[PDB]
Each structure stands twice: as structure tokens, then as C-alpha cells.
Design a protein around this ligand. Sequence first.
Ligand SMILES: *[C@@H]1O[C@H](CO)[C@@H](O)[C@H](O)[C@H]1NC(C)=O
Ligand SMILES: *[C@@H]1O[C@H](CO)[C@@H](O)[C@H](O)[C@H]1NC(C)=O
Ligand SMILES: N[C@@H](Cn1oc(=O)[nH]c1=O)C(=O)O
Ligand SMILES: N[C@@H](Cn1oc(=O)[nH]c1=O)C(=O)O
Lengths: 780, 778
Amino acid sequence: RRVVAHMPGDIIIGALFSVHHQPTVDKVHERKCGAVREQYGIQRVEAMLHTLERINSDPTLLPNITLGCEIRDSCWHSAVALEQSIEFIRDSLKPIVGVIGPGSSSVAIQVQNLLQLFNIPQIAYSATSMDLSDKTLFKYFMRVVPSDAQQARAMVDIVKRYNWTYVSAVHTEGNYGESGMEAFKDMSAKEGICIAHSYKIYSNAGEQSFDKLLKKLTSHLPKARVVACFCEGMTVRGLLMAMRRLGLAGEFLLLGSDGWADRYDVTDGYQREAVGGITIKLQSPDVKWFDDYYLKLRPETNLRNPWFQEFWQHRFQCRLEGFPQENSKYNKTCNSSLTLKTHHVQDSKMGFVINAIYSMAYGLHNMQMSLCPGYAGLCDAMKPIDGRKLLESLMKTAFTGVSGDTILFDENGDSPGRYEIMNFKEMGKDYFDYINVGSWDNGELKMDDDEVWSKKSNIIRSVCSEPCEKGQIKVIRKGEVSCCWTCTPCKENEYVFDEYTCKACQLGSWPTDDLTGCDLIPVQYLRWGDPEPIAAVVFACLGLLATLFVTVVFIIYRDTPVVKSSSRELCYIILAGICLGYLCTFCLIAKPKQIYCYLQRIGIGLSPAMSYSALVTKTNRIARILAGSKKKICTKKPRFMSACAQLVIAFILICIQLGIIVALFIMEPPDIMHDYPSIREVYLICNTTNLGVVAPLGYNGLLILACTFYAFKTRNVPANFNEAKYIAFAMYTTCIIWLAFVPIYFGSNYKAITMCFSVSLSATVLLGCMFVPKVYIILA
Amino acid sequence: RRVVAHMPGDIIIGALFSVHHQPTVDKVHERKCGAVREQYGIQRVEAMLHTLERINSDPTLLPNITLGCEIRDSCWHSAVALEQSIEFIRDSPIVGVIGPGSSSVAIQVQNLLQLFNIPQIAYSATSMDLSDKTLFKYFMRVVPSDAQQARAMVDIVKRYNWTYVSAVHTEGNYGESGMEAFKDMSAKEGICIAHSYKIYSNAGEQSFDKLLKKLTSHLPKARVVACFCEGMTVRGLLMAMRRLGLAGEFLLLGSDGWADRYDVTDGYQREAVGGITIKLQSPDVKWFDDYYLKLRPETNLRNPWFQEFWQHRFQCRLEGFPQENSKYNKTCNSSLTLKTHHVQDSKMGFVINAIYSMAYGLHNMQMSLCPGYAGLCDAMKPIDGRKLLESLMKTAFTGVSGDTILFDENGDSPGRYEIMNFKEMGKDYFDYINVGSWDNGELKMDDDEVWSKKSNIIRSVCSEPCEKGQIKVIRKGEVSCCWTCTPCKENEYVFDEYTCKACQLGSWPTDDLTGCDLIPVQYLRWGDPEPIAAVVFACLGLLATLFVTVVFIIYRDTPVVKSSSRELCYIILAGICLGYLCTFCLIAKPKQIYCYLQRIGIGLSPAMSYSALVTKTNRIARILAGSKKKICTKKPRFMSACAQLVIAFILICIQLGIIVALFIMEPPDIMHDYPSIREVYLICNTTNLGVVAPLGYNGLLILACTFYAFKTRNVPANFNEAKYIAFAMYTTCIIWLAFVPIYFGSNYKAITMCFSVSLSATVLLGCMFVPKVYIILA
Ligand SMILES: *[C@@H]1O[C@H](CO)[C@@H](O)[C@H](O)[C@H]1NC(C)=O
Ligand SMILES: *[C@@H]1O[C@H](CO)[C@@H](O)[C@H](O)[C@H]1NC(C)=O
Ligand SMILES: N[C@@H](Cn1oc(=O)[nH]c1=O)C(=O)O
Ligand SMILES: N[C@@H](Cn1oc(=O)[nH]c1=O)C(=O)O
């Protein structure tokens, strides 16, 4: 059958050490475990035996009690451990007070469901899953190693510290890996990370599984350099063997969780590729006295340990003819000169085994005096020993570990602990080692970043998209995970608000340089410069001087018959109208202000009114004089209107236009409004509407029609130096100009300026072609 | 400690069958169950014993080899799971084990089974999670999954349209999985589960009382209790029912466990009535009953509990045996047997059928391994149920109930339930009566036998439907169970049971709020109340105009009427007559031909019928223009002659131009106006802006002729025809102007327009034309 190591004693404590290897996938119903594991196996078994010798040899710790122990392998498998636990239970009814936990996590769960029923305590020295920390489904489980809830924090801390946010996660099958991922993935997706794709694999999978798993892990090759391997010991060995088989040459930075640890086993022989691997590991101080004891142990005196012979056969690949287990498959023989100090390595999680054994011993020590303090040993109270009373003693007991740190069990049945962020490098020529490169204690991630990455060119940040935050280029989500954001620019008026909002700045403002904020775009207008404004004001000045000259002539020459014959006051009216029309641009272009904003309307409307009204009335009177004299039969109506009625009718014809202007001014208050052709530019002009300008325009258009009709009715008339012979052309010109005005004004983009030119043309065509003629007549 | 009735044999097969009642609350750690299960334990142990002896004594099943057995009393629960595992873990011989009573009592056993490959067939477990073979590989059963039970429960609660239910349940894998399935597959369809109270089977009086008081909190709302209540839970709830003395005010509804059993209802004759109770179909086994009746305490000693079982059954004592139990005062005489008050347990045939299932699987393995030898050859020396379970996977054979046994992939024998109740046959003897049968999704109950009156139990309904015509249901914030039903808008029809939408302008929702409809418009046509006198007025105006036209054209030769003009008068006649034409053309159903005709009329009619008057007044003023001054006035020509016709035509062309312009702007078409949500009509596209322009031009052309006629007023004309034309024309203008209020002041903006046109016509005729007729009369 299967060999079982035992230690005689009144009280026997169980133990499940992964003495052999995990049974090969080929066939497990035969329960054929694989090879013998040294570090996880024989060292742990000898630790058990030797520490039990120390305990039962210690007078102060469990006096007069020889704690025997039954040691059973477990081959690190769901299968063999269950059968061994069954053999524990069948003999429970010599009794077995408690067992020392199995190696992995899933095996711990499976043994725990069995052993919680029968009040048999268990102490696991390596199981590191959250699910076992629950005290409802696994109410009766205890361990001396902190949960992985304090390890997923370590990984999130590392992956945050080095800016990575796009990584690929491989977790070994079983409860340990699945729980570890369901911790790390959630805890990083919450904080700052987005996992590429969380794979899975079996520890003992075939070479094809790794040969394809490397293909998936290189699928994201230029974006996933951080293999978040939450993996057991053998799985990382599998990926490394795959790297060697396929030829990956260090293109990865592994992150080995716990099962990798500083264990040389996983990478020995082929440690040429794991370089850069950042591997967490529980803080396990070394033990020296046991190390010397084990080193000086030889097969000749080792009989209480049954696996020692084949272990000696394995490590030194030879034969021991002095023992029945000759292992004839080997050719060479083993000599006594060989000693264990040659290439000796001590497993990482070794002090935890002794810590667990000490915890069990101290629980028994507490329970002894919890009932019969006087008696030294197993009194009548504990003859039917009850694990119920031992459970609370374990809950409350707190010894001092061999390393030194005090051990306490919380309500969850675990113990606090720290970590150690080791790392793998290349020191010598073909010589590699696990340098301590940091530490971890309740979030205080300390890492000697200087020791590794001897340059500043560290590993690629492994982010899907570079920090695309340059300038106005903004990041937007691709409709998927935030690893690969879609990065796009914003438009000229579209201002990046905080980090991604491509909002558009308001119509009045402009997004400033470097997309820092919105600035109100400076306004532009016509102050005094530019070619056309100064040209128009010079035009106005010339017209003003000419008009002043003509008015002076006709006021200092009011007696001569060449001009006194025509209505002197009507000429005075037209002169004043032309003067104000010229003056309109003198205030139309200066600067748009509240005060001038209505003077502009005053000019543009009022001026043409009397500029043409006196002309219309004069031409109507002339027509009536001539048309009535065409027949001249009687025509005995000397007065008609005549007299001074011309001045009053001009007053009233001014008054109507004044009223129209007042009505517009009241209905449309004069004030400056900001205008803009496009968003690129902003202007400022008066608030006069599309209706404001044209409100007094018809009153003058019809008046122009009336005067041109009466000029037609006169046309060629023998008068005082034939004024009408030029007034006709003047009216033709003013008609065509005022007709061409509307198309030019509407849709001009230069509405404010063309008013002055239109008024200037209307003024000059009238003045020159109806007043100037008589001026050189004054010369004669 | 626990006593075991060991039966030796060549092949010993294990099993897990309860004997006494469930463990007491304070005796859990003592590992000692309490009172005796009279109808369960002895029945099941005698069942295994008798079927085993009949199987081994029959060469047709496992020939030349005897069959042994070994069990450990479990008393239900996982409390004695310690003892069942103590027996189990023996192993390596074990070739067969049979699943214990409760599902959770067997699930961990199955988990352990999956490791070292021992077969196990259940008979009372029902949980669906056990049907999964991924993690429960070596588990089997001869009863179906609880999914069928849940489906049956949903079917029962929905057939009698119970919706708002208050659902207690038991605990373990039965209650939790059963309630998850029942809730998921019930509340989806129509069911309103109030809550799912949880309670252990052996609970105390206080917990049962508080649970009952929570259940009695919805008395007019949920009068059923959708128990997954186990037998013990029903026991306790009925204890509470009696101690409080509930009047059965809510109708119980048990589950798989509670069954027809007299086990827990007794003493409470009138209470728990109406207990619809799903029970598993199993005919009573024949050869078990007589063999059980043959058992006597002195004759049979191999069964340990059997000796004191008589003292437990009959209130007496056995002096002749060490199991005295002196607590009983009376003594047992030689006049007692098991025939009196006998009851056979319902869940009986499943045990025997499962035992036969495993025996036939073992026989199949026996033939398959070494056909040469019938018995135990060298092949069975390596005891291994791994191949045995694979052999029995496909095994099929007839069951003792006349049916067969087949193990599907899920490993449950197909079956069916019964839906049977509790009623009141006669005074002081109240008995259940099998009143239904459910089968694989095909349902059937004798709804008549249940509720053998008109009165039923109050429907498990939170609120009445209250869908009377329009009152529409709506939620409150809780689950879709209780509705504050409310009617929608009068113009809104119920889109569905909880949605409404307003009808379009065409109409309002029809009767019963079934949907929407279309109102038959309605409009103004020939007939009607008001137009009774309208075309009468129009025809009287026609009579007047025809009379005046015939008298004028018959007296046209005399220059009496030729004093001023001839063509202008004819234009007046034409205009007034066509205005009457307008008032005919209106007040009808508007169509495409009518639409533009309306515009043409109410446009050019007053236009020309007043423009001719304008020109005539112009002519008379021009005649009297020079009379006042008469200085020379040697311009008698001007235009005159026939140029008055030209001036009239050029004057009237503007109105036609504007009319055609608005005709282009507004095409002649008929639209459905909406004066009110209730009613609609049909009318042209004419608007205020459409009508005001021709009316404006006609005002422009009426003002001038008013002014010119007033300038004329009293003149020495032919009989001074101008005396009355202006006198009535002032009224003409005042009525035309004062019309705008009435037109834009009521919904009658066609009949008023017609009356306006008719009046504005008749006033011109009666003044400008009536006197001249009397003139040419004499
Ligand atoms: C990356 O992480 C390190 C850690 O301090 C630090 O440089 C910084 O916070 C992150 N960003 C860059 C650009 O380094
Ligand atoms: C609903 O319940 C009433 C109550 O008497 C019953 O008559 C009817 O058959 C049930 N089913 C339907 C579909 O109405
Ligand atoms: N990480 C594992 C333990 N463990 O896995 C290995 O591969 N070695 C080792 O110690 C767990 O805590 O479940
Ligand atoms: N009550 C259980 C079923 N059940 O009750 C028993 O007593 N045995 C049994 O299988 C349920 O509601 O599902």
C-alpha cells in the first residue's frame, strides 16, 4: 500500500506534507504519485520529526507529554489527500487530535469539509485563499499565513507603481488561482488597471497547452509585457519550458504571485529567460539549527523517515546498496563522502510549518490547564479529548514563533503577515539569484527600483495607447474597455473642458491657446484709419468746403436777377440739406457709441427729406407755372399757393420725416450691438434692424420719383440759364444711384460704410448739377 | 448508542434509513434522536429486509449468492451525519449504498463518494443540484427533480388564478432550492409571492407563533400559504394553529412532504382544512402489508426497535422482555396486533423499487463480468462499484408498482404527483379525499369535489382588476402586484392594461375605450336651421334685380335712364347679380371647384359692382366740376366717350390680379378645421390675411365713390336720382365696415359673409335703381 511515517506518543497529531509529486495526468485512479520533492517533501517531513523531538524534549512546553505524530503524504492532489484523511478518520475512533494542513488551497478545502464535522482542528501552513477565511462554510479552519487579500494588494500596488494598465493574467487552476484572480482583477479594474484577458491553465498540463498559451500571451505582444502570473510553482515552470521550446528570449516581465516565490525549482536548469521576473513571497525568516540538523542527517541513521532512501537516490543519482530500496534503475553507487551541504537549498515556506506545529502545541498546553491546572499531562478530564474545547484555546492562544514574531489568530482563523517583493536578475556569468528588491507591509509598497533596471529604459509601460493628451487632441472611449481609447482632436471653437469633453465654446468667446480656456475675442470696428474711412471723410470735407463756398456766394449775391428769380429760401433749404447730408458721415463712422448711434439715423433719414423736398416743391411750382401757361386762356389764379407757403410746406414736409425718425427711435432704442460675420471675427455696429434703415427710405424713394416725374414734365425749358436742362440729368443720376444703392447695401458685409458713399453721391450729384450752374453765372 | 439490525449475507449492501423522529434541539451534540417514527422507521427497515430476503430467495436475481446488508439509523437531519459517515468510511466491503432521507443529508456524502468511486442511489431526495453530475458524479435517484414539484405548484396556484401568495418554506436544500425554482418559475408568469419565511423543522413554539402572526398579516389579501413546509414544519404550524385556534381563514397548500399523512394533522379535525397537498404517486405494496401484520414482538427479535415498537404503539407494557419501559402503566395482553388502525406509509414503493434497481444492476454486472459462473467469481473479488454504476446507468426493468425504472442522464426515475385535499365527510370523522393528479406538465384535478358549494376561498389577489371601461391599472413603487387603477383622459384610449394615448384631432376614443375612431365631420349644407332664410333673402334679391333689369331693358329707349350712362349701369346689374351668385356658391360643402369660386366672388363682385359706380360718380363730378367756376371750362372732351369703359376695366383689373396672386399663394383646397376637440368641419384654406386684401381693395374703391356721391349728394338730376343713392350708400358703407366684428367674432364665418354680401347688394339696388323704375312707370 502507501507508506505512512509515525511517531509514538500518547497524543498523535496528523500531518499532510506534499512528500511526493503531484500524480501525472496520465492516470490518477491508480494513485501513482510522481517523483519525490525535496524542498516541499523531505525537508518538511524532517522538520516535523525534529520539531516534535524538540517539543517532547522540552520540559517547559507540554511537560511529561510525548506528542507523537502520524505523518502522511498527500502528493499535492485532491485524490490522495482525501484517502489519507479517510485513513485519519477511520483510526480517529489511536485518536488523532489534529492535523497539520495540506500544501495547496483546494486540497485544504476538501480536507476541511471532512475534518470540520469531527471537531478535529487543522492548521494550514501555506493555504492562502479567501474562501477558507470564511468561518461559516469553513467555520473550523485555521492557518498561520495571511490571506491573499493582502497579496492582491501587493500586485495592484506594483502594477500601479510602474504605470502599467494593460496586462495579461494567467492563474493556475484550483481554488487558489481562481480566488487570487477574482481578487486581483476586480481590485485593479476598480483602481487603475484593465486586464487584457484573464487566461487559465493547469499545473500539470501537456506541452501543447503551454505552446498555445504562449501564443495567446504573445497575441498582445507590443501591449502586454506584464504577465500577471497568479500561478502555482509548476505553472510558471510550464510557461518557461514553453518559452525555451518556442524561443522567447525575455520579451516578458513575469509577475509570479506566491507559488513561484524564491523557489529555485521552477527556473533551475533553464533560468536564462525568467530575467526581470518580479515575484512576491511570504516573509519567511530562515531557521539554522534545523538546517544543520538536516544537513548532518545521513541515510544510515534515518529510519523513522521512510522516504529518505529514495530521496537520497534521487538527489544523488546513484544507489545505496546498504538499504533494501536499492533502486536498481540507477547505475552508479553512492559513497558516504557525499553530504547534504553540496548545493543545499532551504525551502521558503519552512518556518511556517514549525510555526503551525508550535501553535498546535500551545493550544494543547492551554487546554491542559484550562481544565486540570494541577495535573501535569493528560488528566481524567481530557481522557475523552474534545476538540471543541481546543478550538477556543486555539482562538485565544498566542505563542512566540521561532523566528520571533508573535502569532495571533483573528476571528477569521488566520494570522497577519508581511511580504517581500523579490526579483530575479543576472549578477555573474551564468549565475543568477533572487535579490531582495523590496518589501510590503499593509500597503507600504517599498521597492528598491534602483537595483533593477540599471538604466532608465525600464520595461515598456504596456499601455494600449500612449498618453495621447497632447494639445487639443482629446481621448474618447472606443465603446470598449478603457485600455485602447480613441484619441481625436477638437475643432477651433470646440474647447476641451476637463480631460475628454470636446465641448464647443460659446458664440461670444474663443478657446485660447493650448486649450486652457475660453477668451472673449477682441472686437473690431472702424476708428479713424483704413483707406476707405479716411477716403470717405476726405470726400465729405471736400463736399463741405464746396457747399460752404456755394452758400456763401448765394447769400452775398441775393440781389442779382440771375438767381433771385428762383425761390431763394428753397435753395437755402437744399443747401442746408446737402450740408447735413455731408455731415452724416462725419458722425457715421467715428465710433459706434450710444450718442452717435442715433445721430447716424438722424443723418441718413432726415437729410434726404429736405434735400429733395424743396426740390420737389420748386419743380412742382415751376411745372404749374408752365403747364398752366401752356394754353394761357385765362389762368386768372395768380396766388394758388405761392407766397410764403413754400417755407411752411417745407417745414411740414420736414416734420413728417422727423416724426417717422422719432417713431423708429422710440420703437428701436439706439444702442451698440455686437456683430460677427463668422465665429472667427466679431464686429460692432448699431442695432438698426433690416427694417430700421428702410423705414424712412420709402418716404424718400417716392419723393425722388415725384421730382424725376416733374423734371420729365419740364425737361427742356427756357429758364434763367436753363437750370432744368441740367436738373434733368441730375435726377436721372440720383435715380440710378439710389436704385443701385439697395442691392449694394443688402448683403454687403459692409453695410455701415456704404451708407456714407451713397449719401455722398446723392449730395454731390444734386449740388453740382443744380447749384453750381448759377455760381459761374454770378461771375458774369 | 445506536443499535443496528445486521443481516448477514454473501454480498452486504449499505443504506441510510431513519428510524425515530428528528433530533431534538438540545440533544444535537448528544447524537440521540427523540421519539419514534411509527410510520417511517420500522416500515423502511422491514421493507429492506423483506425485499432483500425475497430477492436472494429468488434465483432470478443474484443466483447462488446471498445478499447481506448494513445500515445506521439517521433520524433525519445532518446531525447524525456523523454516524452515517462513521458507518460509510469503512469502505476498503461496500458495493452498494442508498441515499438517505433529506437531500442535504446526502449531498456531502455524494461529494465524498465522487472521490473513491462508490455508487449511491437516492429515493427521497429531490433537489435539482443533486441532478448535476459534474460535481456529484456517483449519485442516483428513483424520484424526479424538485423542478417538477415547483412546476406543479405554479400550475396549481395559477389554475385557480391565485396571485398574491405568502410562502413559508423549510430549510436545507429542499426549502431553498425549491423556493428559488418556484419563485423564478411562478412570479414570472402571474404569481405575487409575499415573502419567503425560513424556519427549521424542529422550531420552538415561539418561532412558529411569530411566523403564524406574520402570515396572518394579509387576511383579505393572501389566504394561501405556498409551503415547502416539511412534515415537522407543518406539524409546528398546526400546533400554533390549534393553540391560537385559527378558523382556517386561509387555505393551506402543503408540499411534497406533508402528503395525506395522518402523521401530523391529527387531533385537529376542523383545522388545516382545504389542505391542497402534493403527494408522490406510489401504490401500496401488497406483500409488505401481510408480512408486516405477521410480525410479533416475541416471534421477531432481529429488529431492535421492533420490540419496544409495540409499547410505543399501544399504551401498555411487555413484562416478558428486557425492554420493559415501565413508564406505561397498563400491560399488553395477547389480544393486540397491527391490523387495527393500520396505515401504510405513502413513500414506500420507491424504497423497494430502488433496492430492486441496485439488485438488478448488480445482477447485470454479474452476467457481464463472468457469464460462466452465476455468483461471486474471481472478477468480483476486486470489489469495485465504479463499473457497477456504469452498468446500472442504462439498466431498465419493470417496477413492482406495475411501472418501470429508467435512469436518464440526470439519473432520476420519471414520476408524477397527486393533488389531494382534506375535507369534512361527516361529523367526528374527517378524512382526506384524493381529488387530483398532475403528470409531466399535464394537469388534472376534480375541481368539483373541492369546494363542494358556491363559496370558494378568497382569491390570492392584492386588488380587484377595476378595469371598468376606462379605469386603468398602474403600479405604486412595489412589485407588479397591487394597482391604484385610475381612468385616463376622456380623449385618451387605453393603449394596454396600463397605458393610454390621446386620440388624434379626427375624433375621441369610442365606447368601452376599446380604441379610437373618426367623427363624421358635420358641416353646413343645404337646409340647416339658419340658412332657412338665407337663400330666401338671396332669391328675393334676385327677384328685385330681375324685375329692375327687365323694366330697364324694356324702357331703355327713353333717355330717362340714358341721362348719365348705359354700360356702367349694366356693369352694376352684372355685379349685383353675380354677388347673389356668390351667396348661392357659398353655404355648401366646400370642394375644389367651390374653393376658388368663393374667392373670385367675394373679391371681384363688390370690386366691379362698386367701381362702375365710382366711374359714374367721376363722370357726374366732372360734369359739375366746371359748373361752380365756369371761367372758361373749354375742355369738354377729357377722356369721356367710351373711355369710361376703359377706366372701369383698368380699375377692376387690380382686384383680379390680387385675387390670382393670392390664388397662387393659397391653392384652392379644403381642410378639416378643429373648432373643438369634440367636433370638426371642412372649409377652404382662407385665412385673415387672405380675406383682408380683397376687402382692403374694396374699401379703397368704396371710399372714393362715397366721397364723390357726397360731393354730388343733392343735384338737379333726372328726378334727382342722386338724392337716395348716397342716403342709402352711407348705410352701405356703415354695414360693410361694421361687418368685421361679426365675421371675426363667431364661428359662423360663412353665413354672416353671405348676409353681408346680400345686404351690400340690396342696398345699392334699392337706392340706385328703384326710383328710376317708378319714373319709367308713368
Ligand atoms: C508612473 O508611476 C511613477 C510612480 O511614481 C511616476 O513616474 C508617475 O506617478 C507615473 N507617471 C509617469 C509619467 O512616470
Ligand atoms: C379564475 O378564478 C375564477 C374564480 O371563480 C374562476 O371561476 C375561473 O375559472 C378562474 N380562471 C379564469 C381563466 O378566469
Ligand atoms: N500558492 C499556493 C501554495 N503553493 O503553490 C505552489 O505552487 N507552491 C506553494 O507553496 C496557495 O497558497 O494556495
Ligand atoms: N418537505 C420537502 C420534501 N420532503 O419532505 C419529507 O419529509 N421528505 C421529503 O422528501 C419539500 O417541501 O420539498
